[PDB]
Amino acid sequence: MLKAGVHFGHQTRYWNPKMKPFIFGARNKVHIINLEKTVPMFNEALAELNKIASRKGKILFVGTKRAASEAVKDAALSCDQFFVNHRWLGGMLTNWKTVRQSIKRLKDLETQSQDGTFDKLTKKEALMRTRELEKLENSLGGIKDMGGLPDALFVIDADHEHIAIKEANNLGIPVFAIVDTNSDPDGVDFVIPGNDDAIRAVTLYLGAVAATVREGRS
Amino acid sequence: SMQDPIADMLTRIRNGQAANKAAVTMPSSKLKVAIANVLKEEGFIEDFKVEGDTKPELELTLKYFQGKAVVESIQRVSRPGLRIYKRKDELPKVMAGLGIAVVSTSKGVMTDRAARQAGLGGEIICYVA
Amino acid sequence: SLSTEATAKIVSEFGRDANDTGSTEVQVALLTAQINHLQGHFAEHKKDHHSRRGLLRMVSQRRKLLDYLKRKDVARYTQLIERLGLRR
RNA sequence: GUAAAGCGCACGCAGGCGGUUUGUUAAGUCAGAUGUGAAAUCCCCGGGCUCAACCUGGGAACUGCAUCUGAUACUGGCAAGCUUGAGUCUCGUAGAGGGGGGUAGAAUUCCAGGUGUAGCGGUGAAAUGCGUAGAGAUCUGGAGGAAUACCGGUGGCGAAGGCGGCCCCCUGGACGAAGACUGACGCUCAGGUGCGAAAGCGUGGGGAGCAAACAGGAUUAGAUACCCUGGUAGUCCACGCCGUAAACGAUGUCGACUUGGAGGUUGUGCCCUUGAGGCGUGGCUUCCGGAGCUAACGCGUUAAGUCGACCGCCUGGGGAGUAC
Ligand SMILES: CN[C@@H]1[C@@H](O)[C@@H](O[C@@H]2[C@@H](O)[C@H](O[C@H]3O[C@H](CN)CC[C@H]3N)[C@@H](N)C[C@H]2N)OC[C@]1(C)O
Numbered sequence: 013m014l015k016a017g018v019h020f021g022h023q024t025r026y027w028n029p030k031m032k033p034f035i036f037g038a039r040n041k042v043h044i045i046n047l048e049k050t051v052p053m054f055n056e057a058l059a060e061l062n063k064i065a066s067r068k069g070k071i072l073f074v075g076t077k078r079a080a081s082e083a084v085k086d087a088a089l090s091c092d093q094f095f096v097n098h099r100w101l102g103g104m105l106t107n108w109k110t111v112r113q114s115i116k117r118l119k120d121l122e123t124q125s126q127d128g129t130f131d132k133l134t135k136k137e138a139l140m141r142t143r144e145l146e147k148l149e150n151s152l153g154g155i156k157d158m159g160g161l162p163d164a165l166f167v168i169d170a171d172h173e174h175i176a177i178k179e180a181n182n183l184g185i186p187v188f189a190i191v192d193t194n195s196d197p198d199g200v201d202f203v204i205p206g207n208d209d210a211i212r213a214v215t216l217y218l219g220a221v222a223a224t225v226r227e228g229r230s
Numbered sequence: 231s232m233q234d235p236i237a238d239m240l241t242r243i244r245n246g247q248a249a250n251k252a253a254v255t256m257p258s259s260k261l262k263v264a265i266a267n268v269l270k271e272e273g274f275i276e277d278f279k280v281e282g283d284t285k286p287e288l289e290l291t292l293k294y295f296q297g298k299a300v301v302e303s304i305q306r307v308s309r310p311g312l313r314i315y316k317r318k319d320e321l322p323k324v325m326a327g328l329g330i331a332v333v334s335t336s337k338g339v340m341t342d343r344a345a346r347q348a349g350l351g352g353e354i355i356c357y358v359a
Numbered sequence: 360s361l362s363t364e365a366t367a368k369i370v371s372e373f374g375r376d377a378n379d380t381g382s383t384e385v386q387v388a389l390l391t392a393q394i395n396h397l398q399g400h401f402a403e404h405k406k407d408h409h410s411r412r413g414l415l416r417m418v419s420q421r422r423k424l425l426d427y428l429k430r431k432d433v434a435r436y437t438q439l440i441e442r443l444g445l446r447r
Numbered sequence: 448g449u450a451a452a453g454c455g456c457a458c459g460c461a462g463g464c465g466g467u468u469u470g471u472u473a474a475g476u477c478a479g480a481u482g483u484g485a486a487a488u489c490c491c492c493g494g495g496c497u498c499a500a501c502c503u504g505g506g507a508a509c510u511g512c513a514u515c516u517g518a519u520a521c522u523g524g525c526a527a528g529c530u531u532g533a534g535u536c537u538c539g540u541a542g543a544g545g546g547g548g549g550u551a552g553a554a555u556u557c558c559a560g561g562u563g564u565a566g567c568g569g570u571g572a573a574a575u576g577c578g579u580a581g582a583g584a585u586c587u588g589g590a591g592g593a594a595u596a597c598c599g600g601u602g603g604c605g606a607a608g609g610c611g612g613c614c615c616c617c618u619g620g621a622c623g624a625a626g627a628c629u630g631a632c633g634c635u636c637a638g639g640u641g642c643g644a645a646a647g648c649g650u651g652g653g654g655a656g657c658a659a660a661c662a663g664g665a666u667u668a669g670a671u672a673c674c675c676u677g678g679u680a681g682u683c684c685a686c687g688c689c690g691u692a693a694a695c696g697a698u699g700u701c702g703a704c705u706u707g708g709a710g711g712u713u714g715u716g717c718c719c720u721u722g723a724g725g726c727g728u729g730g731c732u733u734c735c736g737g738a739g740c741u742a743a744c745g746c747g748u749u750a751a752g753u754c755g756a757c758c759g760c761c762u763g764g765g766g767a768g769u770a771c
């Protein structure tokens with residue numbers, strides 16, 4: 013309940029009859045999340061992360077939304093985990109074979125920027141290939157070092173990242189997401205009824221899951 | 231109008247199983263109860279309780295095994311305007327045995343399997359598999 | 360519809376007791392009134408088919424009542440017809 | 448629903464189906480038995496011709512009917528109820544609901560007179576046409592018939608077709624509110640009865656505008672059309688007939704279940720009513736849409752989802768909704 017009392021419900025009244033079971037009660041033009049039933053999910057969910065996280069658990073943190081983005085880079089990286097906060101590529105999970113090829117391209121590109129390996133052709137070609145890395149790292153970077161599908165998957169909101177979840181469960185990859193009112197639980201196999209955003213809520217569980225994950229690494 | 235009360239009870243059950251409804255209510259009656267009983271005794275509904283004093287109800291709770299409902303298929307048989315009476319050797323075998331056929335015998339509302347052995351036939355009612 | 364004064368009045372003459380507009384006898388009578396009274400109106404206009412549709416309903420219903428009365432008490436039925444000179 | 452297929456819509460006899468309780472009965476129903484259900488076939492087991500076909504012993508089967516003895520859950524009969532179905536009473540509410548009679552104002556046309564003068568009218572241009580016998584325009588007065596701008600709506604009423612100025616009279620339905628009352632009197636409905644857009648038909652009225660036909664003027668290769676100038680039926684009224692339509696939601700009626708979001712119309716309750724405000728609880732009605740359904744499009748608590756009672760209809764295209 014501690015930090016829990018810093019996010020509660022959200023989303024006016026659009027909701028979804030699917031979240032109804034996890035919903036607390038409405039108020040001031042908006043229902044609240046039944047944290048009382050969220051507490052079990054708080055731990056139980058994370059209790060399954062450390063498990064597989066024990067062996068360099070390939071935990072893929074997903075969060076493209078503005079807020080989470082600048083945060084995932086830290087928490088999701090402050091441990092043997094992976095983060096994705098820039099436009100979830102179409103198939104970077106299922107179409108790995110084809111997507112990874114992009115990562116490799118990004119790799120070598122870094123070596124160029126690394127030392128005297130990017131000093132080629134006029135500033136023209138430089139800028140041409142330089143800007144290429146930027147964007148390429150924005151999407152592939154947060155997963156460049158992973159020559160294999162993830163063991164798990166922890167995405168912030170199960171809505172904005174819908175595409176991400178869709179692929180996971182399709183390949184048979186356990187997904188952990190924070191579904192709230194205007195969210196669809198049918199997807200994520202590990203419900204986490206909490207504010208889809210909330211500057212505090214996002215960071216709260218972000219670091220919360222991070223620890224429970226880094227700890228599992230013995 | 232309610233020309234067939236039984237059908238309603240049956241339909242209400244399946245309609246709930248799909249809506250994941252906890253339980254279901256409705257005006258009870260001798261037969262409605264008997265049928266609901268066999269449904270519980272056979273393992274299709276947790277339990278059931280008929281409320282109301284002057285106006286009887288029926289708190290019929292739907293059962294669910296795992297990620298699905300226990301009642302996968304339930305339909306009426308000896309419906310009105312077209313009754314159905316089988317012999318002690320005609321009783322149908324629902325779902326090759328994995329199912330049940332609620333039949334009203336001259337000794338009560340039992341299941342096909344039970345009634346069959348007892349050596350008595352009766353009027354079918356539904357095929358809850 | 361019918362006038363309250365004439366309503367309560369007839370409700371008593373056939374009411375099984377004091378204030379019982381539910382009794383079958385009452386209904387039949389109550390209906391027969393609006394019936395014989397409306398004819399006068401229908402004798403005029405005639406082409407008021409829409410209002411005619413209603414009239415017929417009162418008839419059919421009255422029949423469904425009188426029939427019921429006889430099916431559940433041949434006594435009251437026969438006597439009821441008298442004070443109303445209906446069903447021939 | 449769009450492939451063939453929901454009667455254009457209602458009322459309703461026969462018929463089919465019937466909420467709930469106790470008792471009762473035992474007809475349907477279930478059980479047993481006894482007759483009988485020809486033998487032969489068929490079938491199972493077993494015999495005989497070297498085998499097989501074929502022949503044969505026994506049994507099964509003949510799922511049918513009748514009688515006797517039981518059983519009584521369900522259906523049926525009867526008795527007695529009950530109240531949630533259906534209906535009645537009291538008081539209201541909204542409404543282009545229906546039948547009748549009034550009456551207002553806007554405009555059109557026509558007639559009469561004033562003013563006034565060479566145009567008007569029309570088209571893509573024109574032309575027919577109307578004009579110096581004075582049109583058009585403008586004004587004044589009068590006649591006459593038809594329809595009701597605005598309000599007006601993604602709105603309301605109705606069974607359907609359909610139903611718009613205002614006033615009155617006669618009249619039907621729907622909805623709500625508290626109660627009080629009857630006690631399943633219900634649902635569907637072949638046949639049957641009635642209602643039925645417009646066009647059309649009969650008699651007799653009416654006739655401003657519009658307008659099949661018809662007549663001119665254009666266009667065109669032609670133009671028995673589209674366009675223009677005219678114009679008869681009819682359109683309006685009364686009474687009677689005709690019964691069709693893409694009579695369409697192209698979706699029969701009654702009832703019960705099944706996530707949600709948004710908007711309209713109408714009743715009632717309750718609120719610091721302090722207010723528009725907000726909180727309930729009924730009716731009807733639009734849009735989006737989930738599950739599920741569907742061949743797809745799409746339907747989606749007003750289903751085309753999940754079910755029950757009854758009815759109607761389909762069975763390849765053309766010939767033909769024709770012939771007889
Ligand atoms: C004056 N407004 C009325 C309004 O009061 C109401 O009134 C009608 C009334 O106009 C009808 O009358 C109308 O139809 C008659 C033939 N059926 C002929 C007279 C005509 N006014 C009445 N039959 C029914 C009322 N509810 O509904 C129609 C309306 C036009 O909106």
Ligand SMILES: CN[C@@H]1[C@@H](O)[C@@H](O[C@@H]2[C@@H](O)[C@H](O[C@H]3O[C@H](CN)CC[C@H]3N)[C@@H](N)C[C@H]2N)OC[C@]1(C)O
Pocket residue numbers: 710
């Ligand atoms: C779900 N959409 C709804 C739409 O169904 C409709 O809802 C009305 C609601 O406006 C009425 O509300 C009315 O009465 C209230 C006091 N009882 C005060 C507000 C008033 N408009 C309700 N009484 C009945 C609903 N069906 O109008 C409002 C809406 C938001 O668009």
Ligand SMILES: [Mg+2]
Pocket residue numbers: none
């Ligand atoms: Mg077609």
Ligand SMILES: [Mg+2]
Pocket residue numbers: none
């Ligand atoms: Mg068709």
Ligand SMILES: [Mg+2]
Pocket residue numbers: 453
């Ligand atoms: Mg129809």
Ligand SMILES: [Mg+2]
Pocket residue numbers: none
């Ligand atoms: Mg024989």
Ligand SMILES: [Mg+2]
Pocket residue numbers: none
């Ligand atoms: Mg009985």
Ligand SMILES: [Mg+2]
Pocket residue numbers: none
């Ligand atoms: Mg309507």
Ligand SMILES: [Mg+2]
Pocket residue numbers: none
């Ligand atoms: Mg006509």
Ligand SMILES: [Mg+2]
Pocket residue numbers: none
């Ligand atoms: Mg005529």
Ligand SMILES: [Mg+2]
Pocket residue numbers: 736747
């Ligand atoms: Mg929809």
